[PDB]
């Protein structure tokens, strides 16, 4: 609600680094809520929480990608606040994403079926918050990529932040 | 003109520090000379102090 | 084109200019730091010993009150 | 060991004797003891990093030291107090120093009076922002240095004076200072180089004149075209003079844009150049 | 005279490389000399704080007694530019080694004249009560 | 003539008198005489280059000199002993110096206390390799120098503290020190040049940072290729930040190979550059 | 606190006592008391900047001091008086200093005698305009410095001597001084640098010598092609020597015009160069 002081840490394991979700403790939040990380008066970002035993009560852990996008330090003091989405105007229905090989060590020229991507994307990143210009990682066939949200549309209004649901189409 | 203008002022900026060096180094020269006229003028009286302190030695010791 | 090769020139000379003059300050410096060095040698000297003579003066005054 | 203990004892002993306590003699011997006490206290206050307490303590020790007759070591104590408050969090850093100068001054020690005088104006400017008094100090101090014939130091101070005098809109009073510090810098060929910036500054300062002065100052300047140092002085000035006389805030702000490539501009120059750049527009968009 | 200007101005940059090289070595002496001067002064203060004490005692004892052309061209200039790294290692340190000392020298001159006075007074008060 | 003889007699006279020999006043003239004796011995020992004997002898004369009640001249002797043991054969070099500072400190002479304080951390580092204690000294000493508004020495110490802080993994605590020593360096147009290296070090020192802390520190840095000095500072840094953000442990290793051409890399830089070179590799497997 | 009042008290007490006021013993404390008085007055005079009243005041206090038995501090007072008159509107500054040196000199203090001696010769030139005597002092003073094995100051003074000697037609005596100051300069590799200018000056100076007094002193010089510092000394000289041995006031006036591109011509050189220019033209139409 009002807000509470927290400490940014490192992502527990890789299993949570491929979910693009701010890992937290169970004694604090629950898997399914949304919050808004507040670092600077001009820096606002929204993440999706996911509890984990490794997390320490009173701190939030992020993954390298997110830690590079929202710019968060492992140790600094941030102000997190519960954010409730408006599923009547924020629900994503059409979102475009920029894809590019995350690592330069695994770059080929073979074709990749998109249909299989948009299907596995919503099957893993379902019920989560995404913002325009957000960075994350996508594991497709044991292959890492660097996604980048370009445009988001609610179910034909344009929104900066939305909530990916089930019947969410991706391009 | 590339490397030229590059190396051009590269020294014009080193021409400033010396302007400060030559001055800060000359200001000391005069201050030290001032101490040379006092420090010595001091011991000059010390020659009197020694003799004076001795004359007091033959009066209370 | 001379208009381009001539431009480079004027820039190099004007560069050489500011140079030599600055270097002049470096020389005079070493010349100044030196003169000062020999002058401090006499300063410390006269001071150092000045402390030796007084050191003997105070040692006597102390033994002149006991 | 305990500062509070010493401060208290010091207090109990710092007081002109009376009654059977005074008897026949009494004064210096006691007040001095208290001085040493407070000094010993201010010391531990300084190791403890309380500074404030250390400074106020030195103020006490110093004042008392004056109550004994020994002005010298006293004044130096005030200096210690000044260094304390200075590196401390409260003020008083200005008072301790004034209390030091009053002493070095009426004592006859002007050389040092000016040594701390410039430190004073240096604090009264960077902190108190009191520029009027700071300048009054940089000036009187330069007068003392000039008295000792210590030209160089006197010039350092004058440069400060004029430099901050131009910031306080006092442009004319600045050009004059640059003139004086200029005619007293050519007697020594060890300042040849230096003689430039002076003319550049004096020509940049404008008391809202309607032409020359500057065009006359650049003229008074003796340059040798095949020169190298001088390239960083008048050559630019001429172009600026033309850009001023002729309302054109495009030929001035451009020439300074180019000059800022072969000779980086410092905060001062920029401040004044912009002021001139404003006079031009304020004559133009008018 | 293209080649006559791209070489003469370059011939100077070459006679310039050593210049800053010659001034750098000459500057090094200022480094080792201003370092030696700083040391020889640490003892001066020592002898200045030594006299300060003795005098205080002496004075008190008297009272108790009274009663590839441009490729190289650049390399030559780069060396001249890199020298600034050494030119920086000088002006800075010593430049500050100047303040610390001067502010100390004044404190040395004062006490130097201070003890001098107390010696004249002590002598005067001593003469009247001599043998 | 013989040191053994002097050392012995010095022992005979170093004892509170009694009976007729003491009379009414035994005085400290005797303990002092003994001091002069041991000093006279330590002297010939220092001549013979026995050092060990010289140092221990000075320790004797010093201790006795304390029994005389003249802390100052004593502490100086402790220093003599320190200079002996230091450039000698045995140890004690650290002890004497500690026994010297306790005196300069309690006395109130922090100016000289810091002078030997840095010498101390310098020995405790170049010898004992007790970095954790050395930093503590370099720091406290810098605090003293900062108090004496002797910015100079203060920075000479802070540089040590930070420099050896990065070696102890303290990267963040290092950059902060560079930030402070930088802020209190811009106020003086006499540090404009060096101010570069600070930003280079701080930008290099990475406490396992992920954001653009360095890209932000490099942005804070006012560079303008025309202010050429900067070339030996951030120009490389940006290239390093690019090879880092691109997890390319080849471009970074190539950049360190090229920069080592325009500006040689000292021990410090090398070690740290390799640490960053590993952060990249360890990120490539992420 | 009134100066006039003090001056009167001082006079009232500065008098050898006798009869009833004497008693038994005279009283050097009296003459000295008066000294302190006058000093106190001279101080406030310098305060209000009346200098003419301060200087003459110090003189009094100084004179009286001699009547005491303290030549040292007295002479220092004479210095205070000289410093006053110097920075004052009247003269006397020359008399005070002569009265100061007679003391430092007879006292066995030549270091200081010469320190004020150079100041003297500097006044008799920059003020009284009497070089004929100034040189005499610059010399005797350089002799004193040469006695204290203080090569430095000795050479500074010699440089003054020759420097103004050339300006007083004394070209030969000038080269001689340059030869001595040049021989006693190579010994120390600390002057190797500036050692060029000496040879250039000497070779330029001509006692109307109708030969190669310089062409003989130009080859004596140890120049080196690679040595670039040297290219700023004899390289030009040779070219000037040919332009004189062929009465060509065009090759000389052109070579000086070209040399003014690689090495700026100071006022000195300029003056002498034109003097040679005249010896040439003059030998053409003469």
XYZ file of C-alpha atoms in Angstrom, chain F residues 95 144 216 266:
4
model
C 57.351 -0.797 18.377
C 44.955 14.309 10.785
C 27.321 7.178 -14.808
C 50.871 -0.156 -13.641
